[PDB]
Design a protein around this ligand. Structure first.
Ligand SMILES: Cc1cc2nc3c(=O)[nH]c(=O)nc-3n(C[C@H](O)[C@H](O)[C@H](O)COP(=O)(O)OP(=O)(O)OC[C@H]3O[C@@H](n4cnc5c(N)ncnc54)[C@H](O)[C@@H]3O)c2cc1C
Ligand SMILES: Nc1nc2c(c(=O)[nH]1)N[C@H]1C(S)=C(S)[C@@H](COP(=O)(O)O)O[C@H]1N2
Ligand SMILES: Nc1nc2c(c(=O)[nH]1)N[C@H]1C(S)=C(S)[C@@H](COP(=O)(O)O)O[C@H]1N2
Ligand code: MOS
Ligand code: MOS
Ligand code: FES
Ligand code: FES
Lengths: 1249, 523
């Protein structure tokens, strides 16, 4: 057994490894290379992406997901990880260096995956790509920090057509212009009774396959192992047969007369796509440009490189409910399947026949496509997704229409997926249009109506509403007829034409405007990130990058699934029967209080008791009752699912959502905010009044580093390596739950791969579980929570509902507001954001005894909700800006004019807003959207304006130690702050360098720990960076004071001499200080966003176009850091208002949206096409630190501008639909589903003229 | 792999970027490049996948030599026999020239004699062998070094590898004995392990075999003394002439000779009547290094041996020769009479002489030694102390190295005493180059008390901060005080140091009486 990684050979003893070990597990735990991450384990996120190289007799390199690829299919290949491309000593790779120097890495957890995707892309294309291709290729790489713009600028600069400005220190890429697969003979047996075969011929395959069938072994024909990503591979699989090495299952044959194309069953989707580009200029196969487009909508680059045609169809075969895009395309083209059942025994059958017949002992040998000449055949297809890429379809469709000489239908194949498991063809519609001209009077009207009636979609959560899916399938057929009308020069009505087009998305771009002041350098300089290069190279270590410890085990939660019930009996035997499963631990094992929190509690974070392990009534679906420990992460997760719980009782009403509780209205409601106005008096006169609602759901943090703690038993205490924003609380919780001394519980947190609030407190269920296990079993424990564990058992941004009345003059001037809001706490009242909702409820508007505000905390049967970027602040701004927009709507006054009518006097927003509307050309662009909306029925433009005054305040204390080395005058800092991607360390390095008077490069920041970080408050509130900067500058001012007398006496010529002279005098070159609440004055951050959208009314899909952001950052400590904070914050908010959606099962309470398959944050193509950010000039802060303002949180509150833009577009559709002019409740999120449901569209409106 | 001097990025030099006159006056190579200076001089390293294989493979690397020394002179005796005791040769220096060119007696004498004192090398025999483990880490190095001086280990590695000091982090939790042999000789293995870790980008473990340690590394400096004494019948010293020679091995670095001179008079009275000349001798042998009480051993040995020789020439009892020479109104004058009385010296000394008259082949002996040992301070030593708000437990991380001498035991007592909490509540964490940044070597027997001073001072800062809170809330217990301090955002972390001059120097008086029995036929 043999694999090459980064140019080094590894002998693989297969007998000793799991049969199903992933390339990821092998890379991380056996080669010891921790650059390659994991998070989703299912192909959706990209953090695990590496490249394979193998033998036309030429070397091909392609990206794969290391989490999905099985080690045993990689034998003899060369594996490349980020570490393989460069490192500090040998020099960083062009791609690594370009991503760091162009500000495309924050937390850094996605950076290696990004680098290796780009490497894969460049190598597969002989180093020649377009900017468009580069932007198309990162659908599989989720970044939660950068908003992707700088990632796209960096990677686009490698393109032949690059128009990107590259920094002059960036090196040039090597020439990329254009090892053999190992295939042992016979099987390889495994202790557990598993077999691998590496057949070279079809004879060998059928030997292996007949073998497996006769010994009654469940088998798998292994290509990419990507199907696991969609439906988990059965544990019952014993015979693995690698088919990635059979030539006979690859390749293609154009028939002699160009009448048919035969495709290898196990061509990869990427190979099928390259084959499409080659044959799309061949008469009769021009339609393969549409097949290419539909394959480009499937999954992402690495899944398409690894995944195969036959693999996909095998999913459809096993799972009829699976709306395969390969299936719907091939069914519409009447593809034939070559089913082979021995070396000399094969049948060519219809797709439908393949699907209806057993495949036991049989393979797909190939697929047969016939020629469809351009003018005689119209072929088109659709995949409507909730975001731009890498999301399964609401509905997909493929349409094949043959036309006779006199423009009539000879035949039609009209196919939909996402309707119901037995629906394929719209048969009544194919028969309707047969032998007719589709454009003849009344036919399309009759066709919709009929189609609308025959679509009866199922309703299996978490799939979208049946009503949306029916309206979508109809709109798609309409869209097809509009498109082919345009192509065949059939007359259409001016207002209907664009209905047949897909939205224009140009190559995205950004602009940044900011000031720097050389007189403060290195402060206010725009710099790379302190850890940028180590983040991109995979040198940077996170908690789970700790090396393999001897006798280590992995932990996973065992969960209760019955809300209101009590667990009376636990059977662990099925878990413990698996070899490598060691133990189960529950509440009975906890020495100390069964409590997740500190010994001394407060009234904000910790007012309500929270168990580590449930001992009473189960409070939510997913509540942990214990942990399994096993010798692999895979086995721990699988064994934990096998522990059987017996329940006694159960709640007869489960209310797992804010809507469920409020619809039933009580012990679940508390009223922390009670207005001093009992009834609004409104003595002022008013011309317009109305009532409305605002509804905003949960948001999953989606940090790319999962919840992680490693605990080592050490010299009678514990060493804890925790991904936490608050080490002190981790330490406190572990010491309390185990009855230990805190000084024996040492926590080290060098960095975390994002937190956004979700690692403030929810890190401690896993940290305390891991520590419990390490303490009891006296062994290292690794607890890397699965995405499903995190999303099922841990909380999220609090959901928000508001009911309001407003009373205004015809100018939009507010006479009164009554508002009631409810925030969804989950099952515990802890960590309420309601204070900040109230703080920002007035935004920048003038009130006078005329704003009645009542606020309720609501407990639901769901995980305890937690802080998420700008908690309370987002809802406070959303609430007030919504009412502003609703006012504009009812009064007919422009939204800028309602804001002007209501602004506070003598206010910064009064200078900023007019200058912003001037520079963004707001007035002409608003008139433009309206003029366009008048000319077009199915494509609508909106412009949304959001303004804000965000409050910044300080809390807690943060220590910092600074030491100068006498050897060379270089500096180290270890502090109580956590670097989570926000550039705390970058800013700290500039401040230490500025204060001491030395270069930035001479400053290094070390790991945060419970020595130099003892007692430190949680890193959050956006003030972390400036707070640690205050601590470090104070410590450095102490060093300066000690150095001053040595300066004056020896008058040194340089820093090295000053420091050695101070060492000779025994000056202490170590200073420890802190920053505490009150060291700095609090302040506000004013921001404005203008967002432009184009809405496709028929699908609900939109493209966010130009976005303009102006924020007061004061004099920015680092414009690069602050631009990146604004883009990231805005983009997380753009997610909240677009594609991110959490669905709780209304009968069980289970969080159904619990993996990448079912939860969709912004991708690379979901961002604004034109992102322009301005840091306000000539605006020094009188308060805070060094004239600067925080940037980590405020911009997420401006993101509702996107919803305001879709709202204008949706209102224009409603107008055209004849809906009486009426407000539609704004919703986080504004999904395609939401917009089609409220657009007033009816299939009777589907006209050609 | 095999690595040698060709693979060194920076200077081929074991030591700091900025050198002194005591530790680093003379060039020392990591790997030899021209003339081999001693048998066992490393020229490179082999790296292998086990300790056994690495050691076996080292012996298989085939060296070809050219030329070779006329005469190899590997011991103090060899250099003095071949060169003579007179310095007018590159191998002999005279750091100590008596201001007396020739001794003139201002007192008359009844007995004169000449003698020699010969003391050889001593191997430290630390039970943990010379050990360094180096990990590549975020473009830098993590260094797990068995060292008495992290700062020198960091400085040396950073210099030889052309790295920033802040990218070379040394952690030393404890060592299994040092006794001076891990002050500087640790850095041959540490520099080599780091070079390999940096070049090969893998973890390197260097655990030096006993043979490697005793062949390639130095030892307690050997001592030779030639002396004349001139005394009265009583044993009262009229004059001494003393020449001594200390064996440096091939380099003059880390001379103990200054300490030999400081204790040469021990606790006896002299009047411009002690001629002392001291020579440093370079031998074809590993560079010799500090070993427990370097120079102090030889200085006391020299003076006490002269007392014992005087005793034997005059027939006066060794205690009585000491009485005749004691400095006036000295602590030793109070201690020695009480010591001789309580040990029953006079009786046991007579019992041994009586036993010896009766038995030809089984002889008894009684040996008396007295000393005044000088304790002085040098360098700066940092300490960081933190109190946890959760439970009031305390952690310390400092620039001292625990090598068994009980430094952490004493620190915990002092931190506990200063803060007013039980000892059990105090933990000491590993020494590192962050909280121990720039810290001097742990040696000179003052390490423990110097760190105790640094820790006490940090704990006094914490008390000053706790004082206002204690007077305001009048707490029932320490945990309540600490949590109230945390509530008011009092900083419960303090960092401070102890430097030379913070405490006053002093002497340690001691006496020893030893009884032996000797089998004359076997030895
Ligand atoms: C993140 C992600 C997103 C995706 N998005 C989409 C999407 O939007 N639309 C969509 O349609 N699909 C989607 N897919 C599915 C993807 O297309 C398939 O997983 C892939 O095509 C499977 O091929 P494979 O080589 O990986 O199969 P494997 O997992 O290796 O094998 C799958 C099955 O096929 C069988 N098999 C393999 N070769 C043959 C053969 N020649 N004859 C018979 N049986 C055979 C095996 O026995 C096995 O049971 C997605 C997958 C992932 C991971
Ligand atoms: N890259 C990155 N940026 C981030 C976060 C994060 O986890 N990763 N957290 C956000 C949140 S919720 C806060 S409170 C701040 C935390 O750091 P700061 O207080 O130093 O700005 O950064 C913000 N920006
Ligand atoms: N157990 C033990 N005791 C020891 C040593 C040692 O290595 N181990 N070294 C000795 C030497 S040479 C010195 S200088 C000191 C070092 O510690 P101290 O200076 O704090 O007493 O302890 C002495 N006692
Ligand atoms: O305070 Mo930010 O971690 S929700
Ligand atoms: O000073 Mo002791 O380390 S020879
Ligand atoms: S861990 Fe592999 S794609 Fe997410
Ligand atoms: S930098 Fe991309 S996920 Fe944090």
């Amino acid at each position: 057994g043999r694999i090459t990684i980064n140019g080094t050979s590894h002998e693989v003893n297969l007998s000793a490894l799991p049969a199903d070990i992933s390339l990821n597990t092998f890379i991380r735990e056996y080669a010891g290379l921790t650059g390659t991450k994991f998070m989703c384990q299912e192909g959706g996120c990209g953090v695990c992406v590496c490249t394979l190289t193998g033998i036309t007799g030429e070397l091909r390199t392609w990206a794969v997901n290391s989490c999905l690829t099985l080690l045993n299919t990689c034998l003899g290949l060369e594996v490349t990880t980020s570490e393989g491309l460069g490192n500090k000593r040998v020099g960083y790779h062009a791609i690594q260096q370009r991503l760091a120097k162009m500000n495309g890495t924050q937390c850094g957890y996605c950076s290696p995956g990004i680098v290796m995707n780009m490497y894969g892309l460049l190598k597969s294309k002989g180093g020649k790509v377009t900017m468009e291709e580069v932007e198309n290729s990162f659908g599989g790489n989720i970044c939660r920090c950068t908003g992707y713009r700088p990632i796209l600028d960096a990677m686009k600069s490698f393109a032949v057509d690059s128009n990107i400005q590259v920094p002059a220190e960036c090196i040039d890429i090597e020439d990329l212009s254009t090892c053999k697969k190992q295939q042992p003979k016979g099987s390889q047996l495994y202790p557990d009774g598993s077999r691998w075969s590496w057949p070279v011929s079809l004879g060998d395959l059928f030997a292996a396959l007949q073998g497996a069938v006769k010994e009654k072994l469940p088998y798998m024909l292994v290509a990419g192992n990507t199907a696991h990503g969609v439906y988990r591979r059965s544990p019952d699989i014993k015979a693995f047969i690698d088919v990635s090495g059979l030539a006979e299952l690859k390749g293609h044959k154009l028939s002699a007369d160009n009448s048919s194309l035969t495709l290898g069953g196990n061509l990869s989707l990427s190979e099928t796509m390259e084959l499409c580009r080659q044959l799309e200029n061949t008469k009769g196969f021009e339609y393969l440009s549409q097949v290419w487009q539909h394959l480009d909508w499937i999954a992402n680059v690495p899944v398409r490189n690894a995944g195969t045609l036959a693999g996909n169809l095998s999913i459809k075969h096993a799972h009829p409910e699976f709306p395969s895009d390969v299936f719907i395309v091939l069914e519409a083209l009447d593809a034939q399947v070559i089913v082979q059942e021995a070396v000399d025994k094969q049948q060519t059958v219809s797709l439908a026949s393949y699907l209806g017949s057993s495949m036991e002992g049989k393979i797909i040998r190939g697929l047969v496509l016939r020629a469809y000449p351009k003018e005689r055949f119209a072929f088109d297809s659709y995949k409507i997704m909730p975001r731009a890429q890498n999301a399964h379809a609401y509905v997909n469709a493929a349409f094949l229409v043959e036309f006779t000489a006199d423009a009539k239908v000879k035949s039609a194949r009209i196919c939909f997926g996402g309707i119901h498991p037995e629906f394929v063809h719209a048969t009544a519609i194919e028969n309707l249009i047969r032998d007719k001209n589709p454009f003849e009077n009344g036919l399309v009207e009759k066709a919709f109506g009929q189609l609308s009636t025959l679509l009866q979609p199922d309703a299996v959560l978490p799939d979208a509403s049946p009503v949306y899916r029916r309206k979508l399938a109809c709109g798609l057929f309409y869209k097809f007829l509009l498109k082919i009308a345009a192509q065949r020069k059939q007359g259409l009505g001016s207002r209907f034409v664009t209905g047949g087009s897909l939205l224009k998305r140009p190559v995205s771009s950004g602009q940044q405007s900011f000031e720097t002041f050389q007189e403060h350098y290195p402060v206010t300089k725009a710099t790379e990130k302190h850890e940028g290069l180590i983040q991109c190279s995979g040198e940077a270590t996170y908690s789970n990058d700790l090396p393999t410890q001897h006798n280590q085990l992995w932990a996973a939660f065992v969960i209760a699934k019955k809300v209101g019930a009590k667990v009376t009996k636990v059977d662990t035997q099925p878990a413990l029967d698996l070899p490598g499963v060691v133990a189960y631990l529950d509440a009975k094992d906890i020495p100390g209080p069964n409590y997740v929190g500190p010994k001394i509690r407060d009234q904000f974070f910790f007012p309500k008791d929270e168990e580590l392990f449930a001992t009473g009534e189960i409070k939510f679906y997913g509540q942990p009752v214990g942990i399994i420990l096993a010798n692999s992460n895979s086995l721990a997760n699988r064994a934990a699912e096998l522990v059987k719980l017996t329940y006694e009782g159960g709640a007869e009403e489960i209310l797992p959502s804010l809507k469920a509780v409020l619809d039933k209205v009580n012990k679940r409601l508390e009223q922390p905010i009670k207005s001093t106005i009992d009834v609004l008096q409104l003595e002022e006169p008013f011309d317009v009044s109305s009532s409305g609602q605002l509804d905003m759901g949960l948001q999953y943090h989606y940090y790319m580093e999962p919840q992680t703690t490693v605990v080592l038993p050490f010299e009678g205490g514990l060493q804890v390596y925790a991904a936490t924003q608050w080490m002190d609380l981790t330490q406190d919780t572990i010491a309390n739950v185990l009855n230990l001394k805190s000084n024996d519980v040492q926590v080290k947190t060098r960095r975390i791969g994002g937190g956004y609030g979700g690692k403030a407190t929810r890190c401690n269920l896993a940290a305390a579980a891991a520590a419990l296990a390490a303490h009891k079993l006296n062994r290292p424990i690794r607890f890397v929570q699965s995405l499903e564990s995190i999303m099922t058992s841990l909380g999220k941004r609090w959901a928000f509902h508001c009911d309001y009345d407003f009373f205004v003059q015809k100018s939009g001037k507010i006479s009164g507001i009554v508002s009631r809001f409810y925030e969804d706490a989950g099952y515990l009242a802890n960590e309420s954001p309601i204070g900040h909702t109230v703080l920002l409820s007035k935004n920048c508007y003038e009130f006078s005894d005329n704003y009645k505000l009542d606020g309720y905390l609501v407990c639901t049967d769901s995980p305890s909700n937690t802080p998420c970027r700008a908690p309370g602040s987002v809802e406070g701004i959303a609430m007030m800006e919504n009412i502003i927009e609703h006012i504009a709507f009812e009064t007919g006054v422009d939204p800028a004019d309602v804001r002007f009518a209501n602004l506070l006097p003598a206010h910064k927003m009064g200078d900023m807003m007019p200058r912003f509307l001037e520079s963004t050309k707001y007035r002409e662009r608003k008139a433009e959207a309206i003029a366009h909306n008048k000319e077009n029925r199915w494509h609508k433009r909106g412009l949304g304006l959001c303004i804000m005054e965000y409050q910044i305040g300080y809390f807690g204390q943060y220590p910092a130690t600074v030491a100068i080395y006498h050897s060379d005058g270089t500096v180290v800092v270890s502090h109580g702050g956590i670097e989570m991607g926000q550039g705390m360390n970058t800013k700290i390095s500039q401040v230490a360098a500025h204060t001491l008077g030395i270069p930035m490069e001479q400053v290094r920041i070390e790991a945060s720990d419970t020595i130099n970080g003892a007692n430190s408050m949680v890193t959050g509130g956006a003030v972390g960076s400036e707070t640690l900067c205050f601590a470090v500058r104070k410590a450095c001012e102490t060093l300066n004071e000690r150095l001053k007398p040595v300066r004056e006496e020896v008058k040194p010529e340089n820093w090295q001499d000053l420091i050695q002279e101070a060492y000779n005098r025994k000056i202490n070159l170590i200073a420890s200080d802190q920053c505490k609440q009150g060291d700095m004055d609090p302040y506000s951050v004013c921001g404005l966003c203008l967002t432009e959208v184009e809405l496709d009314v028929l699908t609900g899909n939109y493209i966010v176009g130009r976005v303009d952001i102006l924020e007061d950052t004061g004099e920015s400590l680092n414009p690069n850091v602050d631009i990146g904070q604004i883009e990231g914050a805005f983009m997380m908010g753009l997610g909240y208002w677009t594609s991110e959606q959490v669905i709780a099962d209304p009968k069980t309470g289970e969080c159904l949206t619990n993996r990448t398959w079912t939860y969709k944050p912004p991708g690379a193509k979901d961002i604004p096409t034109d992102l322009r950010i301005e840091l306000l000039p000539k605006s020094p802060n009188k308060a805070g630190f060094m004239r600067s303002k925080a940037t980590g949180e405020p911009a997420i509150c401006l993101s509702i501008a996107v919803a305001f833009a879709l709202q204008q577009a949706l209102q224009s559709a409603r107008d055209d639909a004849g809906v009486p002019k009426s407000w539609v409740t704004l919703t986080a999120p504004m999904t395609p589903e939401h917009l089609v449901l409220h657009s007033g569209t009816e299939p009777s409106q589907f006209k050609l003229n | 792999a095999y690595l040698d001097a060709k693979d060194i990025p920076g200077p081929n030099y074991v030591g700091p970027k900025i050198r002194d006159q005591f530790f680093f006056p003379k060039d020392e190579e990591l790997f030899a490049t021209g003339e081999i200076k001693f048998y066992g001089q490393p020229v490179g390293i082999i790296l292998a996948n086990s300790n056994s294989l690495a050691n076996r493979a080292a012996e298989l690397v085939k060296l070809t030599y050219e030329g070779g020394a006329e005469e190899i002179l590997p011991s103090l005796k060899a250099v003095l026999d071949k060169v003579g005791s007179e310095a007018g040769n590159k191998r002999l220096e005279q750091p100590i020239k008596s201001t007396i060119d020739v001794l003139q007696l201002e007192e008359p004498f009844d007995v004169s004699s000449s003698g020699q004192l010969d003391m050889g090398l001593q191997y430290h025999y630390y039970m943990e062998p010379q050990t360094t483990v180096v990990l590549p880490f975020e473009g830098g190095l993590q260094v797990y070094a068995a060292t008495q001086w992290m700062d020198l280990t960091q400085d040396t590695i950073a210099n030889v590898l052309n790295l920033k000091s802040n990218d070379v982090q040394v952690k030393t939790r404890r060592i299994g004995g040092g006794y001076g042999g891990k002050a500087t000789r640790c850095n041959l293995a540490a520099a080599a392990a780091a070079l390999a870790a940096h070049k090969l980008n893998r973890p390197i473990r260097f655990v030096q075999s006993l043979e490697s340690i005793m062949t390639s590394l130095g030892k307690r400096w050997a001592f030779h003394c030639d002396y004349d004494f001139f005394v009265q019948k009583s044993g009262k010293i009229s004059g001494i002439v003393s020449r001594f020679y200390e064996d440096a091995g091939y380099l003059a670095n880390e001379s103990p000779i200054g300490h030999t001179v400081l204790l040469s008079k021990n606790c006896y009275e002299f009047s411009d009547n002690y001629k002392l000349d001291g020579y440093l001798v370079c031998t074809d042998s590993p560079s010799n290094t500090p070993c427990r009480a370097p120079g102090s051993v030889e200085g006391i040995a020299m003076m006490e041996n002269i007392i014992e020789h005087i005793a034997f020439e005059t027939g006066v009892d060794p205690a009585d020769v000491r009485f005749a020479n004691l400095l006036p109104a000295h602590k030793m004058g109070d201690m020695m009479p009480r010591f001789l009385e309580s040990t029953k010296y006079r009786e046991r000394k007579a019992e041994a002489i009586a036993h010896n008259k009766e038995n030809r082949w089984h002889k008894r002996g009684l040996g008396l030694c007295i000393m005044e040992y000088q304790i002085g301070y040098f360098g700066q030593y940092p300490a960081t102390v933190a109190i946890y708000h959760s439970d009031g437990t305390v952690v310390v991380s400092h620039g001292g190295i625990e090598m068994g001498q009980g430094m952490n035991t004493k620190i915990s007592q002092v931190a506990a005493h200063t803060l007013g909490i039980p000892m059990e509540q105090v933990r000491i964490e590993a020494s590192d180059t962050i909280n121990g940044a720039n810290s001097m070597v742990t040696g000179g027997a003052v390490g423990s008390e110097t760190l105790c001073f640094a820790v006490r001072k940090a704990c006094e800062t914490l008390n000053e901060r706790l004082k206002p809170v204690r007077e305001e809330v009048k707490p029932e217990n320490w945990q309540d005080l600490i949590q109230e301090a945390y509530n008011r955002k009092i900083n419960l972390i303090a960092s401070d140091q102890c430097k030379q001059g913070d405490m006053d120097p002093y002497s340690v008086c001691g006496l020893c009486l030893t009884e032996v029995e000797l089998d004359v036929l076997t030895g």
